[PDB]
């Protein structure tokens, strides 16, 4: 496939569709690095396998994997899930994957953002990320899709959410941080989102809930369920580490309008009652430069980190008293979809969840 | 997708390997680099594979698979219409470690994943290990969402046989009956594997090939099918040629052979280079114990027979020999309605083979 | 360093000393491969760390480790243990390491045997083993030691034991097996041992206790405690998978004399009462070509697989009722040494134990 | 071995000795990466082999090499040269190697600076450099030597020169560039050099000659031949790419005194008459993020990039008319040493020379 040079998605008539628009397939990277994942990734591999299986009932599923894990990965996953060899540094394809864009006429392209492991050498989560940064192009090659590379602009798919109708929702905590694009003004960043997502309105939330991990990705806080409709985390437990950020996001969203002038309909999503924490007993390597996983570390367990995929919604389950409530709430957001909970506490120990380990590929429409 | 198909054979399941002259959906190639085979860290041969890939792409969608380290360079070198995948490998001979695709009459396609052992394993193979090469067939099948048969404990390479798509396979005794392949099997057991996995009824045995030390005499340097009932065979009257005895004998055998449908084979002569191609001397190639040495004066297996038939084109070796044009003329007469493209591939021949051995076709589904 | 070509240790005046002779250093490879070791090697890395620590009290200790695990390995091990990067396929340096030989005139060389993962493509335990087979040379380079490469002769250090005085002890089950040197007669194999160890008498035991794993390495069955003195595993439990082999080894040893004509003194060593087994809950990858680790598999848990190292002896502990008895018995074999038990059941799940995961380097 | 934490070389009584002080051994990395080195590194491997061979006549020599190249490397090098497997991203051990320091009492330690491929993500020469950055510690482990790690302080051995007597010589162009330690002032950087080298006086030259490559490493411009004596490149060819910087370095050195108050004696060293250039016909991969090697690129061919090693001095030879003159001049700087020229144009295509591909290890004294 080819790089598209000298033009933007917007100029070329391509847009990032909403995650709730029809999907051709879904992508995932197989997890393994022992300085993030306990027990050499054996527990988290089971969780990713379960997520992959859940998605595959709704949408063709694909997993990419290192040279060393290829044979095990192919054995673990059912044959209807396609497996590719692909080098990688960690397994977060929401964030190092391509963001696909489509036009009105049956074509699809990829946006290949610069990836830097959530803050690079300022506050990134490991070093290096050179193989992660090639995942977007390799997936586009597989798909025979041409791509835009955003030179000198760092972004992750998990840091924004689109409605497919001219709006993007994001967080100041993430995009304005020192480790991302520190030379750019907020206005310059807005222009990049407009140009590459094909949007005209940027909705800024303030804080996210994981300042140390992704620097507050919006996908743990709020998302679009449909045009003009958002879900937002909510809690009234003032002891929650998520309390202030959930409260502020909720209040901001109530009065936001999208690009079409619709006042957002905000649907509350609960949070886990109890903190999910790293235990010192977890067998995780310490490596200088890799984010430590220390006893008592509070993990970012948000139910918002779900994947919408065709007729299904794949929702985190953390072993919390609110697991059932979360499924009930998401069901009401998507009354005509099948809601599937998957036990993903093993994913959350590594810094994210179902949404951060997947990347959808939309169906081409038109032509 | 890829499941393995277990407890049955292609023949039992109504699949057959089509002739290489039947319509193709795609062609595959591995990007070359290993410095104990390829001089100058593969730079000269990478240019040659690029030219071969470009030539194929004019006729048939083209695909190259490449190591982690060479991915970025490979993608830069190849035009964008050629798709590039990361794929681990030990060397770049996808005719031999690739899958052999088979089709049925209902529009389906499956892969045959043979056991690969680097042309003789620890008996007389060309390097060690070959564990990544041996996974290429499954990985390409995965990319294609194609289910595959794995031939447990049976070693074979795609370059070691040729099929007419109509019940016949052509092969060499020098290769398939050698100690480093399947020494526990009788000739009859080996015939059965060919019949079951290719869907053939008649195995035509040539004797010697022309590269006993390299592939143990792959048929694809000696003779191939141009169409059902029609073969091409190398030919020389130079008794000083290292190819002479094997060329003369293959030719004589073929003139006495009938295919599975009882047709007397029509044999078309293909010339050989007048001058030997040799390793120099001055080539910068690493020596590693266990890897086939490339020593000054080594005669390289330069056969014009190692061409690829691909849809409306035929891609033919050119060695810088006086017979390069004659070879193109002869191939044109074999395929009067195809476009014949010569590509300078002497840099590939230094590494032990040529255009046919660095490619693997994927047939179109029919029925389908 | 240089390869020594056209001669053998015996011709050049070098011999492999007994393991009970003084040692300069000990070597170990860091374990990790997930199709042998459960939980991506985390539990076994703790056991190897504990073994390395125990050895370091007696003898300078060295661990070699893959690119990916180097940083973790260096963090886990105390600083007195030296850490080198070294590619490898699995972590059994007794078997893919060099066997060092000395001339008792200040010089030392290595024997670099051909390694094939305990049976190659016939019955080996994984494929490939190309990096394992380079370990012996790389360790010799580190030590500035010249080496003899035994072209077309496959051997592992764990398959034989020497007294340093002209005798070697081995098993027919291992050395005569199809996956090792099937082209060679028993007598030709004897001659290779004589040439490369500098011995004159080969003592052949019959069966080992792990036919499927190493093909019956002697180092799980019997060893030399001192010149003229051996220890042999023993059990009276006819339900033991070790029963017949232990019984025959013991009976053979009672009838053997060494190269100096000494009747061997034969001490019995207990065996674990209960079988150690792979559990179904163990999280181990399956890969075609790699020895499967399946529920109920009996693991080769022998107390014989101990390392003699200067003033210490490092002895397996399996969590078995006989763990303390084993330490008692080894103490009586080496009355002037410190006997240290280490919990090594995690190592045994992967097919061997303390002796297999170490390689000594003798003092010059 | 151990990391030394909570103290510096200076506090602990360790100093970096001059390169002209006795050496136990020398280190080198084996080159191969095809997006720097033409022909998959075959020509440059021959050059590194020749450099290693020359050094070995004076001082025991050691080469470290990738998994893939180990067997070829061991075959190419004579057996007296010890070969170790060691992962790396490129082959510039002067710069990613440890800088050894010694005390007066028979001990040696290593300083392990942060390495970032000569400017990191600002203007570094490739990405990533994670394996390069582990070379210093792995070499220290081989040697059983304890090391100081300079957290958050980036430095390369080729960016400074010491006299072993309290002075360090360096360049503003390199140490003060954005891609190195931009949060640190000049004064903060001086303090790090003083603490880690055990020096009291930092002599700042201005420009180096390779702003795009190493950002002007001092070891292409000037070095110490002995306490109180320096060599400095010199040319009167105004068309020379090295003219302005050679002229300015020379003038600054003429005004400089060392940490012991000695007026520096400055010895001129010629520069090549003709520019060494990359040819478009060189077969070198282009990779976004790796310094391109384009037709007509002027290579940094300095005769200053020589290695002093015990009784020998190993001097670049570029195939230039001034090759002999360079040997004559270095001979007069070291009248009692054996001067050995080695053809190293294949090294210079990749951005440096003999000094940048070696790292000495001093003899323990006392």
3-state SS record for D185-243: CHHHHHHHHHHHHCCCEEEEECCCCCCCCCCCCHHHCEEEEECCEEEEECCCCCCCCCH
What's the topology of domain A1-367?
3.75.10
C334-349: string of b/e by CB count within 10 Å (b at 16+)?
beebebbbbebbbbbb
d(C-alpha B300, C-alpha B351), whole Å: 8
Question: How many angstroms separate the CA atoms of D239 and B264, rounded?
Answer: 78
Count CA atoms within 13 Å of residue D26 on its CB side.
34
Q: Which two tokens stand for residue B94?
A: 């996808």
Distance CA B219, CA B156 (A): 12
C128: preceding bond cis by omega (within 30 degrees): yes
SS3 of residue A313 by DSSP: strand
Q: For residues C189 and C148, is the Cβ–Cβ distance under 8 A? A: no
d(CA C245, CA B194): 45
Q: Is B212 helix (H, G, I), strand (E, B) or coil?
A: coil
Residues B142 and B2: beta-carbon distance below 8 Å: yes
Question: What count of other Cβ atoms lies within 10 Å of the Cβ of residue B238?
Answer: 12
DSSP state of B50: H
Of D2, D67, D134, the CB nearest to C79: D2
State CA C211 to chain mean position distance: 15
Strand partners, A343: A317
Give me the phi and psi of B249, to 5 degrees please.
-70, -40
- Closest residue in chain C to residue A72, using alpha carbons only: C285
* Domain C1-364 CATH assignment equals 1.10.580.10: no
- Among D334, D324, D281, smallest CA distance to D303 is for D324
**Which residue does chain D place closest to B45, by CA atoms?**
D39
The CA distance from D296 to D280, in Å, is 7
Residue in D17, D199, D200, D218 with CA at minimum distance from that of residue D109: D17
Select from B90, B124, B127, B128 the residue whose CB has the most chain C CBs within 10 Å, as the one to mutate to test that interface.
B128
C356 is catalytic: yes
CB C314 within 8 A of CB C338: no
- Which residues of A form the catalytic set? 356
**Where is D307: in which H helix or E strand?**
strand D307-309
Decide: helix, strand or coil at residue A311. coil
Looking at chain B, how many residues does it have? 368
C261 touches chain A (CB under 8 A): no
d(CA A273, CA A324): 12
Q: Are C90 and C126 in contact (CB under 8 A)?
A: yes
Phi, psi of C37 (to 5 degrees): -95, 125
Looking at residue A176, the DSSP 8-state letter turns out to be: T
| Residue partners of D5: CB distance under 8 A and separation at least 6 | none
Find where tokens 């520019």 sit: D275
Spell out the residues 6+ positions from residue A116 whose beta carbon is closer than 8 angstroms to its own.
A124, A129, A133, A154, A179, A180
Architecture per CATH, domain D1-366, reads as 5-stranded Propeller (3.75)
Domain ranges of chain B: 1-368
Residue A42 sits at the chain C interface (C-beta within 8 Å): yes
Pairing relation of β-strands B109-115 and B100-103? antiparallel
CA–CA distances in Å: residue D133 to residues B140, D114, D129: 37, 7, 6
The CA R_g of chain C, rounded to the nearest whole Å, is 19
Q: What is the CA radius of gyration of chain B?
A: 19
SS3 A28: strand
Q: How far apart are CA C93 and CA A250, in angstroms?
A: 60
Give me B214's structure tokens. Answer: 């390299």
- Dig out the tokens for C80 from the structure: 């007195």
Query: What are residue D315's DSSP bridge partners?
Result: D341
Dihedral of the CA atoms D194, D196, D198, D204 (nearest 10)? -40
Output DSSP code: residue A18: P
- What gap in Å lies between CA D25 and CA D307, rounded to an integer? 12
**Of residues A213, A170, A212, the one with CA closest to residue A192:** A170
Question: Do the beta carbons of residue B5 and residue B148 sit within 8 Å?
Answer: yes
Neighbours of C269 (CB within 10 A): 24
Across the beta sheet with B230-234, the strand order is B223-227, B230-234, B266-270
Picking from B333, B307, B325, the residue whose alpha carbon sits closest to that of residue B59 is B307
Which chain A residues contact residue B86 at CB under 8 A?
85-87, 138
Note whether C283 contacts A43, CB cutoff 8 Å: yes
For residues C169 and D207, give the distance between their C-alpha atoms in angstroms, rounded to a whole number.
Answer: 70
Do D119 and D82 touch, CB atoms closer than 8 A?
no
Q: Which residues contact D324 (CB under 8 A, 6 or more apart)?
A: none
DSSP H or E segment with residue A9: helix A9-12
SS3 breakdown of chain B: % helix, strand, coil, rounded to 5? Answer: 25, 25, 50
SS (H, E, C) chain C: CCECCCCCHHHHCCECCCCCCCEEEEEEECCCCCCCCHHHHHHHHHHHHHHHHHHHCCCCEEEEECCCCHHHHHHHCCCCCEEEECCCCCCCHHHHCCEEEECCCCCEEEEEEECCCCCHHHHCCCCCCCCHHHHHHHHHHHCCCCEEEEEEEECCHHHEEECCCCEEEEEHHHHCCCCCCCCCCHHHHHHHHHHHHCCCEEEEECCCCCCCCCCCCHHHCEEEEECCEEEEECCCCCCCCCHHHHHHHHHHHCCCECCCCCECEEEEECCCCCCEECCCCCCCCCCCCCCCCCCCCEECCCCCCCEEECCEEEEEECCCCCHHHHHHHHHHHCCCCEEEEEECHHHHCCCCCCCCCCEEEECC
The answer to whether residues B61 and B78 touch, using CB atoms and an 8 Å cutoff, is no
**Rounded (to 5) percent helix, strand, coil in chain D:** 30, 25, 50
Q: Quote the CA–CA distance of C204 and C194 in Å, as a whole number.
A: 13
Distance of CA D1 to the CA centre of its chain: 25
DSSP D26: E
Is some CB atom of chain B closer than 8 A to the CB atom of D281? no
Cα–Cα distance, C206 to D351 (Å, whole number): 63
Q: Which residues pair with C263 in a beta bridge?
A: C257
Distance CA A324, CA A342 (A): 11
Q: How many of the other CB atoms lie within 10 Å of CB of B108?
A: 17
Instruction: Give which of A226, A262, A250 is closest to A335, Cα–Cα.
Output: A226
D128 touches chain C (CB under 8 A): no
* Side-by-side strand order, sheet with A222-226: A222-226, A229-233, A265-269
Q: Which residue has the tokens 């290719």?
A: B198
CA distance B116 to B99: 10
Helix count and strand count (H, E) for chain B: 10, 18
D137 at interface of C, judged by CB pairs closer than 8 A: yes
Measured at the alpha carbon of residue B22, what is the angle toward residues B18 and B28, in degrees to the nearest 5? 80
**CA A190 to the chain's CA centroid:** 19
Q: What is the CA radius of gyration of chain D?
A: 19
Contact (CB, 8 A) for B248 and B206:
no
Contacting residues for A154 by C-beta, under 8 A, at least 6 apart: A113, A114, A115, A116, A120, A180, A181
List of chain D residues whose C-beta atoms are within 8 Å of the C-beta of residue A128: 127-128, 130
Question: Is B3 at the interface with chain D, CB within 8 A?
Answer: no
What is the separation of C-alpha A321 from the centre of its chain, rounded to a whole number of angstroms? Answer: 25
Other CB atoms within 10 Å distance of the CB of residue D37: 28
- Burial grade of C187 (CB within 10 A; 0-12, 13-18, 19 or more): exposed
Return the closest-CA partner of residue A238 out of A216, A262, A271, A215: A271
Q: Which tokens sit at B221?
A: 């340097």
Q: In which region does residue D277 sit, left (phi positive, over 0), alpha (psi from -120 to 50) or beta (all else)?
A: beta
Q: What is the DSSP string of B147-167?
A: -EEEEEEEE--GGGEEE-SSS
Q: Token pair for residue A111?
A: 């946006």
Q: Are D220 and D156 in contact (CB under 8 A)?
A: no
DSSP, res B16 = B
Rounded distance, CA B309 to CA B304, Å? 13
Q: Using an 8 Å Cβ cutoff, are D288 and A151 in contact?
A: no
Handedness of CA B288, B294, B297, B298 (dihedral sign): positive
Q: Which of C302, C335, C336 is nearest to C222 (CA)?
A: C302
Strand pairing category for D229-233 and D265-269 = parallel
For D3, the token pair is 């990391």
Please report residues of A whose CB lies closer than 8 A to that of B90.
Answer: none
* Residues of D that are catalytic: 356
Q: How far is A131 from A139, CA to CA, in rounded Å?
A: 13
Residue A335, judged by CB atoms within 10 A of its CB (0-12, 13-18, 19+), counts as exposed
**CB within 8 A of C301, min separation 6: which ones?**
C271, C272, C275, C276, C316, C318, C320, C345, C348, C353
CA B335 – CA B268 distance, rounded (Å): 11
Q: Please give the C-alpha separations between residue A229 and each of A193, A222, A308, A329, A356, in angstroms, as whole numbers.
A: 20, 10, 14, 14, 21
Q: Can you say how many angstroms the Cα of residue C330 is from the centroid of all Cα atoms in its chain?
A: 17
Residue D49: its H or E element: helix D42-56
d(CA A56, CA A342): 13
| Among candidate residues D339, D303, D295, the one with its CA nearest the CA of residue D319 | D303
Greatest Cα pair distance in chain D = 54
Q: Pick from C84, C137, C138: which is nearest to D141 by CB?
A: C84
State yes or no: C236 annotated in a binding site.
no
Q: Phi and psi of C101, rounded to 5°?
A: -130, 145
> Residue D70 is inside which H or E element, if any?
helix D70-76
Question: Is A287 close to C35, i.e. CB distance below 8 A?
Answer: no
Residue C163 assigned ligand-binding role: no
* Most B CBs within 10 Å, among D40, D72, D88, D282, to test the B interface: D40
Q: Nominal resolution in Å?
A: 1.6
Experimentally, how was this structure solved? X-ray
Residue D86 exposure: Cα atoms within 13 Å on the Cβ side = 34
Closest-CA distance of chain C to residue A130, Å:
15
Q: How far apart are CA B280 and CA B117, in angstroms?
A: 28
Query: What is the C-alpha to C-alpha distance for residues C44 and C349, in angstroms, rounded to an integer?
Result: 9
CATH fold for the domain made of B1-368: 3.75.10
Our separate counts of H helices and E strands in chain A read 11, 16
Residue with tokens 């009248």: D335
Give, for B173, the enclosing helix (H) or strand (E).
Answer: helix B173-176
Using the Cβ of D279 and the Cβ atoms of chain B, whether some distance falls under 8 Å is answered with no
Coil, helix or strand for A210?
coil
Is the Cα torsion angle D342, D347, D352, D356 positive or negative in sign? negative
- Of B114, B131, B97, nearest in space to B28 by CA: B97
Sort residue C49 into left (φ over 0), alpha (ψ -120 to 50) or beta: alpha
Contacts of residue D251, defined as CB under 8 A and 6 or more positions apart, other chains included, come to none
Nearby residues of D36 by Cβ (< 8 Å), 6 or more positions away: D90, D126, D284, D290, D291, D293, D350, D351
**Option in A1, A67, A83 nearest B142 (CB):** A83
- Cβ <8 Å between A87 and B86: yes
């Amino acid at each position: 496939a080819k790089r598209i040079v000298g033009s933007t998605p917007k100029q070329d008539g391509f847009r990032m569709p909403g995650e709730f628009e029809p999907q051709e397939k879904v992508w995932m990277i197989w997890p393994e690095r022992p300085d993030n994942w306990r027990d050499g990734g054996k527990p988290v591999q089971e969780a990713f396998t379960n997520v992959a299986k859940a998605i595959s009932q709704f949408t063709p599923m694909n997993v990419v994997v290192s040279q060393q894990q290829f044979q095990n990965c192919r054995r673990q996953l059912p044959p209807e899930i396609t497996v590719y060899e692909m080098s990688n540094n960690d397994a977060w394809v929401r964030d190092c994957g391509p963001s696909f864009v489509i036009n009105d006429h049956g074509e699809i392209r990829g946006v290949d953002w610069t990836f830097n492991a959530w803050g690079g050498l300022v506050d990134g989560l490991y070093f290096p990320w050179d193989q992660d940064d090639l995942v977007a192009q390799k997936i586009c090659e597989i798909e025979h899709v041409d791509s835009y590379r955003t030179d000198d602009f760092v972004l992750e798919g998990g840091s924004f959410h689109v409605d497919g109708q001219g709006t993007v929702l994001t967080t100041e905590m993430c995009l304005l941080s020192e480790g991302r694009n520190p030379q750019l003004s907020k206005e310059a960043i807005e222009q990049k989102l407009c140009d590459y997502l094909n949007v005209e309105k940027v909705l800024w939330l303030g804080d996210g809930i994981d300042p140390e991990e992704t620097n507050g990705h919006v996908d743990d806080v709020a998302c679009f369920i449909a045009p003009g409709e958002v879900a937002c985390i909510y809690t009234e437990d003032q002891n929650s580490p998520f309390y202030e950020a959930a409260q502020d996001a909720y209040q901001r969203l109530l009065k936001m309008t999208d690009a079409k002038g619709r006042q957002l309909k905000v649907h509350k999503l609960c949070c886990p009652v109890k903190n999910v924490t790293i235990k010192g007993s977890f067998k995780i390597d310490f490596v200088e430069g890799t984010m430590p996983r220390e006893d008592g570390d509070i993990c970012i367990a948000s139910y918002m980190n779900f994947l919408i995929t065709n007729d299904g919604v794949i929702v985190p389950q953390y072993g919390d008293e609110n697991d059932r409530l979360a499924l009930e709430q998401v069901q009401t957001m998507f009354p005509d979809k099948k809601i599937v909970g998957v036990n993903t506490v093993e994913v959350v120990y590594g810094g994210g969840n179902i949404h951060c380990i997947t990347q959808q590929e939309p169906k081409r429409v038109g032509g």
